[PDB]
């Protein structure tokens, strides 16, 4: 993957531009996806200006005359198969180009060579042709461009009207032209020989090569698009299309006029995210705005809440945020209007983008540095890009523009500072509220009756209601959930329980919510939805609210402010309406609102206060959905707004799922009354109502921010109405009609069961005389509660069976488990074979099947070391595979003791934290593991309480004892698919023995990501469920995240079979596997290996107390204090007996079924038959969308390849062939090489050889050194061991020093470069990720997210950007330059030595956990002096030498940053 | 709060009086909790998910909820939530065997940590609410048109009668003996259950409006078809009263008295009726050698009552 | 694709249920594509069946006219949202068809349903 742009400053055409463009494109073959056929690609495109002279000469050759004005060429893909459609397309384009007055010059068939493209990509190759037209009316150029664009759009619409598919238009303009296709990005100039002539010379050029997930290519889906390029993916595209449909009707401009009517459906059909972004961008720029203004309005800079920018830019950003909803997502944009060329980043700056200026007036930019070969002495500036920045080139006068100058020129054009104060905030109205109007809070009996009307039990009002008002945050869970799904339940479940939240796997990186809170917002705007193309003051007159949720007092204040334009609507329906009262009520409301909005009302306030004994409350979610979707389909939602009052929402999930429907605000007036009645009963103590309400509001805000960051969105303005949810158990019609766009994999109950349950609950609440709330069990088991999974009798029977070692007791346990009513999905099927029963003495052995099951990872931090080692040895004793999980592991357990038992694990994990990841830790296993997203709590990192980190676990995780460890949810290394491929290559390079696996959690559309990772050479995919365990997590995350692994696994199997990819990767499932029946079912669905998990822990003595998060497990398993540890009763024989019994049961059921071996059943979906629950439930769950399958063909239904998938080798291989004496006699060496950018992960296989021969610290420093010249590739020196010195002359690409383990890497420019060192970038983003030991010396500026998660390493650089030293844990960093904004976010260990002249540090620091001061102790003075001395004597920077020279007056300019919780542990008191 | 302090505390039952000091009276052995020790012992519970304490108790109390309540003050809510699923908490908390029902299966019990004083704190939280009249008679608001009958004043009969009066029916009881209460007033001792609390419970149940019939045998004073003719539904709560015997040589002498007769006469002379079979008979244990046959809590009560009523020598055998 | 199938299912269900007829469920016809040519396999569509039962006590002719209106409106709908290669072979309560681009002889070996008694 890659995107880049070249341009000339002045603007004179020259062949060198396209020459360097094609050359740089020819070197993007290392980031691609090379396959076995080697010919098929996944899309590549180039984009230049029109070569007028060539077409003029050609048309002179034909026989016409070349006019004085410029020409315009239109390039099109026409159907190739049938000769009946090409005539139609020619007819259409000619009819619609001759209807305006222009003169056709003729057609032309571009010469091509189809010999290099593969076969599968050739089966859908369309016919490429071009037409030539010319301005003859003497009209200006801008009118020419506008008219051609309108003609092109009209042709597209007219041809779409005839259903004549397989037709596309590349680009129709007189300034730009596009050559794109599905070939390989290297052989472009061979497919298009036109680019080989000496006349195609342009002022600018764009090149792009994408990385597609699936394998089926479609030509019209190749980048660049019309007037835009892109990299990555946009998270918030679902709500963007809906808001665009809303804005379509309230826009017009005289530039279009009558033909404006021809452009109503702005966003077409059947495109990716970049396609919609491109169409909107084009239709906006054709109105008069330039490129930078449109970029600032579409993807606005992250609005920082500080004074780091002049206020004019702040007013401009406020206006742009008000006028158009942002577009989040990782993106590196290179947009090219016919006048400007702007390269910019997104809000967060998640992807790299580096540019170089030559001394010839030539600017180049892209994702890498050494793609195009540049001379070393002709470089003027090597620059990078941070968040929200943008660099611009103006060809109209030949002028460059960096960030500040460009934005200042932009904000010069209009008086932005005077339009912002026209609006007002809410606090002004709150502060003037007269102290009056106290509503008499309803009686306790009334409140209890209304609460029973929605089944809100009492455990809710004290488990997740008391902490939210008392502490100021949400509750904490301790284990997976075993309550059935919302449809299979029996009690009245709220409608929100049928909605599962979404997240993002490797396709989209989630963003943390505890560090980068400055880049997120919850602003709501009332009275802003309107025109988008015009400019006036009628768009800055509105009201702004800071939070989408409101209390009662503020809501009444707003209602009093809105005056005589607010229309109320009753959301209650008469219970005696009849069998179909709900449909009548919904029709009535969805008609009444459309009536009221046209009468003169601009606000709709949906209320439900009219609930009475004869009228029940319509579910607010469904009513809001219907009303919003009707206002959207009726072209009215823009005209009004929507404020909702509820009576059933209490937790953070309800407000989120209700906002995700389309409502603007949400008010809950029951929770406040319950809080008041609980406060006046003197329960919180002496906390007044105001402070409690404030803490409650803050907790709700935190919850909304967490749930909004769980997906990758930054601003609520794009999430409202986005419909980022999954529905299970709802009918296809109801969801597909009342809700905008939510995929329901299985149809479910309609409007009969819902109304039935609602009326039954209303009757059991109001019609009877109730006085006390029921106890209820949803978070902890009770006798009057629903059916949980782990029942007391079940646990006791299993424990007696595993202790007595009795097969009959285990059989009785399995029977007891199977004889329950339906609880999960696997309770709705039934095995059904057709063959004759085979005697049990003919199926395979017990050990041969035992060698499949494994036990998942368990963090050393959550568990006690005793149970850890016990499970480890119990799995390693028989020969099966075990796990280790995160949290590292003790090194002393690498070799067996005298007794003959190995405490080492067989599988190591690579989580987002990378705590115990050193060189030695990654070479003592036979299988690696990537923890992309955890099962029980996806979209979140591993959590651990503050007092659970003892001395041992801290010395193991390389952390300061006594801190609440929160691993970052983002991965900081997998931002897209190609980065995942790079990490896979790194892991396969460091360990030439084992394999690497990836973990996932089930959701809709996971098959695409599966087929994507299947092209990344990965060979084992572990698909988790949503019923697994954890150490600690919020209950909202446990109960409301993921889907049962049935749909996910059954869809991954289908997808991986559909692209001939099943035969290359294994498949392993886990999550909720208890007995043999479920194991056989999972194997039937298409799995090979399995897991046990919590079940095994029950054999270990776990009693499901669900108090593991307090380090007080009574049986002594999840404990880190020495007192409870001595209560352990674990014994590996228990696990051996458990596995033996499970294998015996599976053998017996398979023998009875009719087969002989498991490897002859995988994929046989036809052996199951769905059985109905009957007519007692009237639900319509049809599981057929899972039982489906595609015939495999010739390959096997399972993996049929032994050994790992080989990957190509880089230069380091040839290095090993030269370093014989170091591995035969051990003598020093000193090598030199000319390294290039297409060599990834240099210096890792040598590191593996060293650590297998000698170890980590077995050598002296600087034993072997390598001098590389020229720029280096990605992931330089990843996992270097102490003794190796990599000296590179030039600059590193990305991820340098990832996981440094004692080595030494130095980067310095070529000594013959006339560049000032401290004024140029020399490293990419994400430097020294996961570093634990070593020294790094730079000679330039650093990228972004610098030295994150450092543990014990030292680093010296000459500058940094945003999020520097984020979540650092230990080591030493010295930055000599300008630090970025939000520095040292969450730093709880180590130090920072900053050098800043203009006193800008107190403005950028994140003064939360760290303190900054002057240097006061002579010891640290000498330490810093010696560090700078080592730097200057190692890399010889002029700036460091000058600093070293004048030392008397420079230390008083240095500042020191030190964490707070480390003041009382430093042996040297930093104070006096 | 936080009620998870079972790591740094020790199980301590309420104040018990020594052995000798009870060898002469008829009062109870265990004393009522002090406020401090009770509030402390209420903290040791673990709020365990899937509580094994509830899954074993027969009436299926909501043990953790009122445990948390009593540990967090406000005894009122605890009392109501404990009464919501039980009609006689004092009897249950005083007599029910915790070693096999409640304190035998606590989650902390299976790790040698010792269970929490569930039964005695149950008795306490029931009784401490009697100082301010927090207990109220469960009388219905409106009267419903139906009469119902129940024979036997045993615990089953008492609970069913209370529930039927809570429904709205008209309840009538029938007992063979005068002082109603089934075996709760004549069979069980006075040192185990001071009859004051049982009399308070009987008075509370009578205050609801249910009519009582002391000294009414169904066999002679009526007949089962006659009860079916009078009341639409008679509930059988006769329990069991026909004892066994042994067929072997030697049973032809005198001084053979079964356990039920001696126990009933002892309970009577404790309460009244001045039965002559104790004084003017061989039912006394002044200085004799009283041996008992059979086993269980029955023979336990026999030997305990014996050592209370003189009986310088007492023996007990079990097969 | 596994995103057009779900959309098509939702369209057909929200079209049929808009009249009142009950929908028992779907069915996947048994097939064996090791007998058809290769070029046809590159364009084979997923073959599904739906079952619908009357609950209004409607007579025969009105039911047939209603099924015809249903099929017409559902074809217009699927034509509306720009998804080609979707088709309905025959939707009735009297007729049924099995047609495909396979060899004429291999019919009984391609659709085993016909070998039933
Ligand atoms: C700590 C402890 C101590 C115990 N001590 C004893 C003990 O000393 N003795 C003992 O027996 N059990 C004892 N038990 C056991 C327990 O008391 C009994 O198992 C339980 O009370 C059974 O009583 P019931 O429900 O059958 O009521 P019962 O009292 O057995 O019901 C009989 C009632 O029906 C009436 N009745 C019977 N027949 C007729 C009729 N024909 N017409 C009218 N009315 C009629 C009787 O007058 C009486 O009111 C003890 C248990 C524990 C835990
Ligand atoms: C106590 C416990 C700790 C766990 N720790 C981790 C962890 O640190 N990282 C991780 O990815 N999964 C962790 N898991 C989840 C397991 O990988 C796996 O999903 C789980 O064993 C399946 O649960 P099940 O037995 O209910 O099917 C943990 C699970 C449990 C029960
Ligand atoms: S008795 Fe045991 S199970 Fe019940 S609340 Fe206490 S610790 Fe938990
Ligand atoms: S304390 Fe004893 S009698 Fe009372 S509910 Fe618990 S087990 Fe039953
Ligand atoms: S909840 Fe955890 S602490 Fe032990 S008793 Fe169960 S495994």
Matching CATH number, A781-1203, of 3.20.20.70, 3.30.420.40, 3.40.50.720, 3.60.21.10 = 3.20.20.70
Nearest to A214 by CA among A1013, A933, A999, A998: A1013
B80 at interface of A, judged by CB pairs closer than 8 A: yes
Q: Which residues contact A467 (CB under 8 A, 6 or more apart)?
A: A473, A474, A475
Q: Whose CA is nearest to atom 2 of ligand 2?
A: A1030
Q: Which residues contact A161 (CB under 8 A, 6 or more apart)?
A: none
Chain B contact probe: residue of A476, A1105, A1110, A1127 with most B CBs at under 10 A? A1105
Residue A1296 has which token pair? 């340098």
Please identify which residue in the block is written with the tokens 């939805």.
A529
Q: Is A177 left (phi over 0), alpha (psi -120 to 50) or beta?
A: beta
Task: Tell me which residue in B51, B65, B111 faces A1127 most closely, judged by beta carbons.
Answer: B111
Active site residues of A: 1
Domain of B114, in residue numbers = 1-136
Half-sphere exposure of A1145 (CA within 13 A, CB side): 23
CA of B183 to the centre of ligand 1 (A): 4
Rounded Cα–Cα distance for residues A252 and A266 (Å): 13
Q: Which residues contact A1016 (CB under 8 A, 6 or more apart)?
A: A977, A980, A981, A984
CA distances from C64 to A96, C49, C61, C92 (A): 44, 18, 5, 7
> According to the 3-state scheme, what is the secondary structure of A1312-1353?
CCCCCHHHCECCCCCCCCCCCEEEEECCCECCCCCCCCCCCE
C95 at interface of A, judged by CB pairs closer than 8 A: no
Rounded Cα–Cα distance for residues A265 and A280 (Å): 11
Binding-site positions of B for [4Fe-4S] cluster read 92, 96, 102, 106
User: C-chain residues within 8 Å CB-CB of A270?
Assistant: 82
Please identify which residue in the block is written with the tokens 């002096």.
A1425
Q: Whose CA is nearest to atom 6 of ligand 5?
A: A1104
Residue A1280 has which token pair? 């270097």
Strands A1264-1269 and A1284-1289, sheet pairing = parallel
Strand order in the sheet with A995-1001: A927-930, A995-1001, A1020-1024, A1066-1069
Q: Helix B63-71 crosses helix B118-127 at what angle (to 10 degrees)?
A: 70
Residues A50 and A177 sit within 8 Å (Cβ to Cβ): yes
Chain breaks in chain A (C to N over 2.5 A) after: none
User: A-chain residues within 8 Å CB-CB of B48?
Assistant: 1103, 1105-1107, 1114
Residue A98 neighbours by CB distance under 10 Å: 12
Q: Is the CB of B219 under 6 A from ligand 1?
A: yes
> How far apart are the CA of A1102 and the nearest CA of chain B, in angstroms?
11
Q: Which residues contact A80 (CB under 8 A, 6 or more apart)?
A: A125, A126, A127
Strand order in the sheet with B170-174: B170-174, B147-151, B234-236
Residues A1178 and A1186 sit within 8 Å (Cβ to Cβ): no
Q: Is the CB of B234 under 6 A from ligand 1?
A: no
Rounded Cα–Cα distance for residues A568 and A555 (Å): 14
Residues A1116, B60: C-beta atoms closer than 8 Å = no
Residues B148 and B171 sit within 8 Å (Cβ to Cβ): yes
Residues making up chain B, counted from first to last:
319
Residue A86 has which token pair? 């090409």
Residue A407 neighbours by CB distance under 10 Å: 24
Chain A contact probe: residue of B102, B108, B111, B166 with most A CBs at under 10 A? B111
User: C-chain residues within 8 Å CB-CB of A747?
Assistant: 9, 13
Q: Give the ligand whose atoms come closest to the C-alpha of residue B52.
A: 3
Rounded Cα–Cα distance for residues A972 and A966 (Å): 15
Task: Among B11, B54, B67, B110, name the best residue to mutate to test ligand 3's pocket (greatest count of ligand atoms within 8 A of Cβ).
Answer: B67
Q: What is the dihedral of CA A193, A194, A195, A196, to 10 degrees?
A: 60
Strands A1391-1395 and A1410-1413, sheet pairing = unpaired
Chain C contact probe: residue of A119, A218, A733, A1010 with most C CBs at under 10 A? A733
Residues A1439 and A1389 sit within 8 Å (Cβ to Cβ): no
A762 at interface of C, judged by CB pairs closer than 8 A: no
Q: Is A376 left (phi over 0), alpha (psi -120 to 50) or beta?
A: alpha
User: C-chain residues within 8 Å CB-CB of A1051?
Assistant: 2
Which atom from ligand 5 is nearest to the alpha carbon of A1103? Answer: 5
Residue A768 has which token pair? 């009877």
A1443 at interface of B, judged by CB pairs closer than 8 A: no
> How far apart are the CA of C37 and the nearest CA of chain A, in angstroms?
13
Residues A34 and A186 sit within 8 Å (Cβ to Cβ): no
Q: What's the distance, Cα to Cα, between the start and end of chain B in Å?
A: 51
Strands B234-236 and A642-646, sheet pairing = unpaired
Q: What's the distance, Cα to Cα, between the start and end of chain C in Å?
A: 36
DSSP A846: S
Strands A1410-1413 and A1454-1459, sheet pairing = antiparallel
Q: Give the ligand whose atoms come closest to the C-alpha of residue B4.
A: 3
Residues making up chain C, counted from first to last:
117
Query: Which neighbouring-strand residues pair with B174?
Result: B151
Q: Is the CB of B151 under 6 A from ligand 1?
A: yes
Residues C14, A165: C-beta atoms closer than 8 Å = no
CA distances from A479 to A776, A832, A1028, A1036, A1037 (A): 19, 35, 8, 12, 11
Chain C contact probe: residue of A275, A583, A732, A1058 with most C CBs at under 10 A? A732
CA distances from A77 to A115, A192, A276, A907 (A): 19, 15, 20, 51
CATH topology of domain A423-780: TIM Barrel (3.20.20)
Nearest to A246 by CA among A721, A656, A716, A605: A721
Nearest to A9 by CA among A416, A363, A521: A363
Residue A572 neighbours by CB distance under 10 Å: 17
Nearest to A1217 by CA among A1240, A1245, A1236: A1245
Residue A479 neighbours by CB distance under 10 Å: 25
Residues A913 and A941 sit within 8 Å (Cβ to Cβ): yes
Rounded Cα–Cα distance for residues A49 and A206 (Å): 10
User: C-chain residues within 8 Å CB-CB of A736?
Assistant: 10-11, 13-14
> How far apart are the CA of B111 and the nearest CA of chain A, in angstroms?
6
Nearest to A1400 by CA among A1452, A1455, A1458: A1455
Q: What is the dihedral of CA A773, A779, A781, A783, to 10 degrees?
A: 20
B249 at interface of A, judged by CB pairs closer than 8 A: no
Rounded Cα–Cα distance for residues A31 and A980 (Å): 11
Residue A912 neighbours by CB distance under 10 Å: 24
Q: Is the CB of A1094 under 6 A from ligand 2?
A: yes
User: A-chain residues within 8 Å CB-CB of C2?
Assistant: 1005, 1007, 1051, 1054-1055
- CATH 2.160.20.60 domain position(s) in chain A: 1204-1472
Nearest to A728 by CA among A935, A503, A499: A499
Q: Is A63 left (phi over 0), alpha (psi -120 to 50) or beta?
A: left
Closest alpha carbon within chain C to A215: C1
Nearest to A1198 by CA among A1022, A1374, A1057, A1076: A1057
B107 at interface of A, judged by CB pairs closer than 8 A: yes
Identify the H or E element spanning B174.
strand B170-174
CA of A898 to the centre of ligand 4 (A): 52
Identify the H or E element spanning A400.
strand A399-401
CA distances from A1169 to A738, A767, A1191 (A): 32, 43, 19
Rounded Cα–Cα distance for residues A480 and A779 (Å): 10
Identify the H or E element spanning B267.
helix B259-271
User: B-chain residues within 8 Å CB-CB of A1127?
Assistant: 111-113
Residue A113 neighbours by CB distance under 10 Å: 12
CA of B67 to the centre of ligand 3 (A): 9
Nearest to A1180 by CA among A730, A743, A726: A730
Closest alpha carbon within chain C to A747: C10
Residue B197 has which token pair? 């609390």
**H-assigned helices in A1204-1260:** 1212-1218, 1245-1253
Q: How far is CA A604 from the centre of its chain?
A: 35
- CATH 3.60.20.10 domain position(s) in chain A: 1-422
Chains that touch B (3 or more CB pairs under 8 A): A
Rounded Cα–Cα distance for residues A1019 and A1066 (Å): 6
Residues A479, B49: C-beta atoms closer than 8 Å = yes
Number of H helices, E strands in chain C: 4, 2
Residue A841 has which token pair? 């003495």
Residues A1199 and A1065 sit within 8 Å (Cβ to Cβ): yes
Rounded Cα–Cα distance for residues A563 and A547 (Å): 22
Identify the H or E element spanning A1438.
helix A1438-1445
Residues A158 and A96 sit within 8 Å (Cβ to Cβ): yes
Q: Is the CB of B101 under 6 A from ligand 4?
A: yes
Which atom from ligand 5 is nearest to the alpha carbon of A479? Answer: 1
Q: Is A393 helix (H, G, I), strand (E, B) or coil?
A: strand
Burial level of A1371, CB count in 10 A (0-12/13-18/19+)?
buried
> According to the 3-state scheme, what is the secondary structure of A1009-1046?
HHHHHHCCCCCEEEEECCCCCCCCECHHHHHCECCCHH
Domain A1204-1472 part of CATH 2.60.40.10: no
Residue B75 neighbours by CB distance under 10 Å: 18
Rounded Cα–Cα distance for residues A963 and A944 (Å): 9
Q: What angle do CA B57, B58, B61 make, to 5 degrees?
A: 60
Residues B111, A1116: C-beta atoms closer than 8 Å = yes
CA of B107 to the centre of ligand 5 (A): 11
Report phi then psi at C81, rounded to 5. Answer: -90, 15
Q: How far is CA A1336 from the centre of its chain?
A: 30
Residues B60, A783: C-beta atoms closer than 8 Å = yes
CA distances from A1355 to A1198, A1229, A1382, A1386, A1430 (A): 48, 25, 19, 19, 11
Residues A269, C32: C-beta atoms closer than 8 Å = no
Residues C28, A745: C-beta atoms closer than 8 Å = no
Rounded Cα–Cα distance for residues A116 and A44 (Å): 14
Rounded Cα–Cα distance for residues A939 and A509 (Å): 9
> How was it solved?
cryo-EM
**H-assigned helices in A324-390:** none
Residues A386 and A28 sit within 8 Å (Cβ to Cβ): no
Q: How far is CA A1459 from the centre of its chain?
A: 30
Half-sphere exposure of B192 (CA within 13 A, CB side): 21
- Homologous superfamily of domain range A1-422: Aminohydrolase, N-terminal nucleophile (Ntn) domain (3.60.20.10)
Rounded Cα–Cα distance for residues A755 and A623 (Å): 13
Residue A130 has which token pair? 């071009």
């Amino acid at each position: 993957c890659g995107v880049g742009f070249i341009a000339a400053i002045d603007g004179k055409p020259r062949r060198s531009v396209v020459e360097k463009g094609i050359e740089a494109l020819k070197a993007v073959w290392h980031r691609g996806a090379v396959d076995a056929d080697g010919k098929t690609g996944d899309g590549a495109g180039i984009h230049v200006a029109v070569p007028q002279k060539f077409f003029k000469d050609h048309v002179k050759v034909i026989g016409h005359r070349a006019p004085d004005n410029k020409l315009a060429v239109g390039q099109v893909f026409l159907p190739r198969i049938s000769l009946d459609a090409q005539e139609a397309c020619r007819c259409i384009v000619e009819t619609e180009i001759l209807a305006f007055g222009y003169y056709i010059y003729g057609w032309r068939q571009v010469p091509i060579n189809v010999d290099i493209i593969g076969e599968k990509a050739n089966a859908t190759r369309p016919e490429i042709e071009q037409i030539i037209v010319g301005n003859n009316k003497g009209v200006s150029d801008e009118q020419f461009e506008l008219d051609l664009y309108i003609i092109r759009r009209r042709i597209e619409k007219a041809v779409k009207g005839e259903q004549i598919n397989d037709f596309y238009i590349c680009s129709l303009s007189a300034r730009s032209i596009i050559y794109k296709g599905m070939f390989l990005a290297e052989q472009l100039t061979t497919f298009y020989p036109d680019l080989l002539d000496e006349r195609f010379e342009s002022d600018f050029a764009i090149y792009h090569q994408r990385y597609s997930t699936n394998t089926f290519p479609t030509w019209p889906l190749a980048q660049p698009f019309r007037m835009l390029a892109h990299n990555g993916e946009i998270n918030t595209v679902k709500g963007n299309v809906n808001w665009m449909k809303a804005h379509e009707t309230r826009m017009e401009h005289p530039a279009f006029g009558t033909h404006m009517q021809d452009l109503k459906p702005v966003i077409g059909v059947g495109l990716s995210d970049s396609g919609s972004l491109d169409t909107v961008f084009e239709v906006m720029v054709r109105a008069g705005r330039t490129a930078p203004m449109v970029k600032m309005m579409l993807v606005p800079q992250a609005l920082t809440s500080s004074q780091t920018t002049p206020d004019n830019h702040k007013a401009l950003i406020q206006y742009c945020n008000s006028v158009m909803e942002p577009w989040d997502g990782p993106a590196a944009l290179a947009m090219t209007d016919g006048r400007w060329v702007v390269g910019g980043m997104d809000r967060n700056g998640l992807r790299p983008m580096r540019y170089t200026i030559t001394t010839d007036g030539l600017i180049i930019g892209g994702s890498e540095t050494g793609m195009v070969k540049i001379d070393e002495t002709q470089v003027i500036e090597k620059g990078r890009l941070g968040p929200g920045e943008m660099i611009a080139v103006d060809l109209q006068s030949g002028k460059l523009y960096r960030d500040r100058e460009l934005k200042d020129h932009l904000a010069t054009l209009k008086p932005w500072d005077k339009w912002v104060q026209n609006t007002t905030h809410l606090d002004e109205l709150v502060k003037t509220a007269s102290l009056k109007g106290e509503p008499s809070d309803m009686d306790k009996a009334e409140l209890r009756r209304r609460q029973q009307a929605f089944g809100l039990t009492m455990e809710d009002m004290e488990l997740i209601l008391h902490p939210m008002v008392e502490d100021g945050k949400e509750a904490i869970g301790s284990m997976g959930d075993d309550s059935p799904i919302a449809v299979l339940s029996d009690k009245y479940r709220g409608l929100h329980h049928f909605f599962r939240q979404n997240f993002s796997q490797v396709t989209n990186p989630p963003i943390d919510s505890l560090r980068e809170r400055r880049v997120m917002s919850l602003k709501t705007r009332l009275g802003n939805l309107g025109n988008i193309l015009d400019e006036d003051e009628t768009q800055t007159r509105l009201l702004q609210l800071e939070s989408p949720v409101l209390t009662t007092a503020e809501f009444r204040a707003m209602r009093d402010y809105m005056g005589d334009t607010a229309a109320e609507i009753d959301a209650t329906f008469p219970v005696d309406g009849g069998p179909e009262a709900l449909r009548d009520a919904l029709r009535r409301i969805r008609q009444e609102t459309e009536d009221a909005v046209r009468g003169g009302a601009t606000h709709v306030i949906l209320t439900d206060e009219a609930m009475g004994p004869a009228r029940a409350a319509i579910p607010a979610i469904l009513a809001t959905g219907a009303v919003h979707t009707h206002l959207i389909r009726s072209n009215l939602r823009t005209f009004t707004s929507l404020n909702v009052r509820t009576a059933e929402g209490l937790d953070t999930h309800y407000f989120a799922v209700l906002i995700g429907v389309g409502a603007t605000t949400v008010n809950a007036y029951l929770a406040q009354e319950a809080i008041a009645e609980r406060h006046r009963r003197g329960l919180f103590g002496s906390m007044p109502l105001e402070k409690g309400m404030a803490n409650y509001k803050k907790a709700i805000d935190d919850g909304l921010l967490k749930i909004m960051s769980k997906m990758g969105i930054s601003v609520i303005s794009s999430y409202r109405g986005g419909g980022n949810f999954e529905a299970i158990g709802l009918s296809r019609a109801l969801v597909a009609e009342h809700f905008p766009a939510m995929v329901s994999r299985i149809s479910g109950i309609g409007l009969n069961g819902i109304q039935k349950k609602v009326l039954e609950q209303h009757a059991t609440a109001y019609n009877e005389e109730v006085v006390a709330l029921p106890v209820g069990g949803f978070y902890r088991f009770r006798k009057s509660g629903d059916r949980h999974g782990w029942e007391g009798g079940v646990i006791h029977t299993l424990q007696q069976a595993v202790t007595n070692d009795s097969y009959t007791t285990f059989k009785k346990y399995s029977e007891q488990v199977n004889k329950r009513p339906p609880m999960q999905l696997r309770d709705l099927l039934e095995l059904r074979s057709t063959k004759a029963p085979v005697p049990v003495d003919e199926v395979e052995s017990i050990t041969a099947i035992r060698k499949r099951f494994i036990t998942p990872g368990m963090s050393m931090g959550a568990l006690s070391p005793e149970a850890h080692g016990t499970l480890n040895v119990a799995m390693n004793r028989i020969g099966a595979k075990s796990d280790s999980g995160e949290g590292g592991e003790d090194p002393a357990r690498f070799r067996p003791d005298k007794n003959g038992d190995n405490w080492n694990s067989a599988i190591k994990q690579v989580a987002s934290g990378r705590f115990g990841v050193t060189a030695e830790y990654l070479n003592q296993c036979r299988e690696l593991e990537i923890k992309v997203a955890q099962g029980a709590k996806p979209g979140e990192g591993g959590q651990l309480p503050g007092f659970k980190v003892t001395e041992m676990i801290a010395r193991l995780r390389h952390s300061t004892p006594g801190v609440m460890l929160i691993s970052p949810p983002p991965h900081h290394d997998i931002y897209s698919i190609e980065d995942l491929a790079q990490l896979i290559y790194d892991l396969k390079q460091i360990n030439p023995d084992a394999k690497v696996t990836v973990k996932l959690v089930s959701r809709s559309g996971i098959g695409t990501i599966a087929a994507g990772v299947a092209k990344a050479n990965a060979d084992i995919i572990l698909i988790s469920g949503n019923s697994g365990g954890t150490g600690a997590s919020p209950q909202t995350s446990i109960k409301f995240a993921g889907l049962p692994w049935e749909m996910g696994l059954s869809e991954v199997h289908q997808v991986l079979t559909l692209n001939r990819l099943r035969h290359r990767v294994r498949l392993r499932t886990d999550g909720g596997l208890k007995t043999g029946r479920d194991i056989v079912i999972a194997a039937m669905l298409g799995a090979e290996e399995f897991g046990i998990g919590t079940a095994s822990l029950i054999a270990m003595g776990c009693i499901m107390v669900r108090q593991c998060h307090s380090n007080t497990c009574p049986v002594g398993v999840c404990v880190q204090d020495d007192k409870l540890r001595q209560k352990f009763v674990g014994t590996p024989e228990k696990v051996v007996n458990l596995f033996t019994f499970l294998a015996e049961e599976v053998r017996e059921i398979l023998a009875g079924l009719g087969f002989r071996s498991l490897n002859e059943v995988i994929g046989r979906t036809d052996l199951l038959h769905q059985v109905s629950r009957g007519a007692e439930h009237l639900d319509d769950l049809d599981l057929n969308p899972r039982l489906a399958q595609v015939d495999p063909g010739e390959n096997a239904r399972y993996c049929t390849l032994q050994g790992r998938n080989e990957v190509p080798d880089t230069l380091d291989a040839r290095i090993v062939a030269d370093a014989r004496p170091l591995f035969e006699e051990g003598e020093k060496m000193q090598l030199a090489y000319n390294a290039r950018n297409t060599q990834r992960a240099i210096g890792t296989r040598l590191s593996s050889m060293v650590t297998r021969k000698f170890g980590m610290f077995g050598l002296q420093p600087g034993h072997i050194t390598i001098r590389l010249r020229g720029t280096a590739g990605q992931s330089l020196g990843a996992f270097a061991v102490q003794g190796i010195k990599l000296e590179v002359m030039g600059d590193a690409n990305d991820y340098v020093g990832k996981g440094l383990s004692g080595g030494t890497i130095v980067v310095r420019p070529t000594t013959s470069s006339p560049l000032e060192t401290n004024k140029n970038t020399i490293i990419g983003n994400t430097v020294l990720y996961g570093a634990t030991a070593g020294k790094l010396f730079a000679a330039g500026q650093a990228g972004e997210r610098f030295a994150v998660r450092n543990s014990g390493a030292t680093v010296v650089v000459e500058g940094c950007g945003s999020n520097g030293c984020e979540y650092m844990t230990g080591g030493t960093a010295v930055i000599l330059g300008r630090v970025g904004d939000n520095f040292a976010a969450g730093m709880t260990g180590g130090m920072a030595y900053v050098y800043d002249l203009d006193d800008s540090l107190p403005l950028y620091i994140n003064d939360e956990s760290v303190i900054f001061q002057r240097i006061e102790v002579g010891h640290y003075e000498s330490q810093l002096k010696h560090l700078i001395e080592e730097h200057v004597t190692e890399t010889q920077s002029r700036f460091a030498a000058e600093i070293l020279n004048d030392w008397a007056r420079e230390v008083t300019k240095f500042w020191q940053v030190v964490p707070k919780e480390m003041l009382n542990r430093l042996e040297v008191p930093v104070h006096l | 709060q936080r009620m998870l302090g079972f790591v740094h505390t020790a199980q301590r039952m309420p104040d018990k009086r020594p052995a000798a000091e009870r060898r002469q009276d008829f009062a109870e052995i265990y004393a009522r909790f002090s406020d401090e020790r009770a509030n402390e012992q209420a903290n040791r519970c673990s709020q365990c998910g899937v509580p094994f304490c509830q899954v074993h108790c027969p009436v299926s109390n909501n043990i953790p909820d009122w445990l948390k309540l009593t540990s967090e003050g406000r005894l009122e809510e605890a009392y109501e939530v404990s009464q919501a699923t039980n009609n006689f908490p004092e009897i249950c908390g005083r007599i029910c065997p915790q070693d096999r029902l409640c304190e035998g299966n606590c989650v902390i019990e299976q790790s040698t940590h010792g269970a929490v004083t569930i039964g005695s704190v149950e008795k306490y939280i029931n009784d401490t609410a009697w100082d301010q009249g927090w207990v109220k008679p469960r009388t219905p608001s409106r009267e419903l048109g139906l009469s119902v009958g129940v024979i036997g004043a045993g615990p089953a009969g008492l609970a069913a009668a209370e529930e039927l009066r809570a429904k709205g029916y008209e309840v009538h009881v029938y007992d063979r003996y005068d002082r109603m209460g089934g075996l709760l007033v004549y069979g069980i001792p006075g040192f185990k259950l001071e009859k004051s609390v049982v009399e308070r419970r009987v008075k509370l149940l009578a205050d609801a409006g249910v009519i009582y019939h002391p000294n009414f045998e169904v066999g002679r004073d009526a007949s089962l078809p006659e009860l079916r003719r009078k009341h639409v539904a008679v509930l059988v709560a006769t329990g069991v009263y026909k004892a066994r015997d042994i067929k072997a040589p030697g049973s032809g002498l005198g001084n053979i008295v079964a356990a039920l007769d001696y126990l009933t006469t002892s309970n009577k002379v404790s309460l009244g009726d001045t039965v002559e079979a104790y004084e003017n008979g061989s039912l006394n244990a002044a200085g004799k050698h009283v041996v008992v046959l059979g086993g269980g809590d029955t023979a336990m009560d026999c030997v305990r009552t014996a050592i209370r009523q003189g009986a310088t020598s007492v023996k007990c055998l079990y097969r």
